[PDB]
Amino acid sequence: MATLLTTDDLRRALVESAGETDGTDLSGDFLDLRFEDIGYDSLALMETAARLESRYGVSIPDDVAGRVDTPRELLDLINGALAEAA
């Protein structure tokens, strides 16, 4: 569905894009945590966006994904696209 995503939707993707058995703490309100701090270089960050693209019907440009600092922004990229996909 093109139903606007929440913190947890983003979380789910951020687990999947990270790897497997991710010993970290990424939930609640991680929106202000910079990708660099949470083990996100940018390729895995694109991985997040790309997965959300196919799943929710959005599309996220490459240079944008490798530009956003915080998950807040990435979530908003998705939600902005979802609003257009509604």
Contact between residue 78 and residue 51 where contact means Cβ atoms under 8 Å apart: no
Delineate the domains of the chain, giving CATH numbers in brackets: 1-86 (1.10.1200.10)
CA Rg, the chain, in Å?
A: 12
Residue at token pair 């606007």: 4
Task: Go through 1-38 and write b for each residue having 16 or more CB atoms within 10 A of its CB, e for each that does not.
Answer: eeeebeeebbbbbbbebbeeeeeeebeeebeebebeeb
* CA distances (Å), origin 57, targets 36, 37, 60, 72, 80: 27, 28, 10, 19, 12
* CA distances (Å), origin 18, targets 22, 43, 68, 84: 7, 10, 17, 28
What ranges in the chain are assigned the alpha helix state H?
Answer: 7-16, 43-56, 62-65, 71-84
